[PDB]
């Protein structure tokens with residue numbers, strides 16, 4: 001019912017959330033209930049149960065948006081504008097904040113092996129500065145790749161510049177530090193979880209980055 005106000009009926013045919021599926025509903029009942037239980041117990045976001053829960057949240061959310069970042073952004077629009085999303089789904093803004101921070105910890109736990117203490121502390125602080133702007137960029141990268149946009153075109157370079165701004169926001173401006181992050185990406189599959197990125201779109205982006213650099 002709620003999805004009808006936010007997705008076209010064509011989109012509803014491909015949005016798994018809108019499927020009749022008992023297991024999907026049970027899965028989210030568990031994921032929401034377990035998040036609230038950890039929060040009730042004042043579980044820190046860097047506790048292993050929270051990290052594991054948040055990793056599972058992101059896997060499930062990408063599955064149930066059919067890997068479409070524009071469907072993820074649509075859900076976030078919904079959460080802000082639909083009243084009673086707490087009452088309908090159990091998902092609260094405070095719960096998303098918890099999952100967001102726990103998922104960040106899942107990546108900071110890996111970056112710790114690639115960064116020195118100063119770099120890691122910088123990223124722990126600034127990872128959240130512009131985190132919320134990534135889904136919109138990912139959707140635009142998907143569209144550029146789908147439309148066969150030239151990575152060297154002005155608007156392709158606009159996308160590369162946007163990536164750099166968001167990347168430097170969390171990584172800093174030091175070239176040697178940035179090299180560590182890009183090496184970590186190459187070597188750690190988990191660091192591209194919760195991104196809605198595909199190998200095809202990543203390849204397009206890295207071509208656009210190559211032109212820019």
Ligand SMILES: COc1c(NC(=O)c2ccc(NC(=O)c3ccc(N4C(=O)[C@@H](NC(=O)c5ccc(NC(=O)/C(C)=C/c6ccc(O)cc6)cc5)C=C4N)cc3)c(OC)c2O)ccc(C(=O)O)c1O
Pocket residue numbers: 017025028029032061072075076089090091096100131132134135138181182183185191192194195196197206
């Ligand atoms: C690693 O760096 C790189 C990169 N990187 C990247 O490409 C990159 C790309 C993207 C990202 N990030 C993201 O995409 C990115 C994703 C997501 C968020 N997000 C959000 O959307 C916000 N809401 C949610 O989460 C949220 C959670 C739950 C729901 N549930 C529901 O609605 C419903 C209806 C449930 C339901 C329940 C019960 C029912 O009964 C029924 C229903 C809804 C919403 C909060 C956060 N946090 C934020 C961000 C990213 O991370 C920063 C990246 O790094 C590339 C190349 C190199 C190189 O070297 O070449 C490199 O180094």
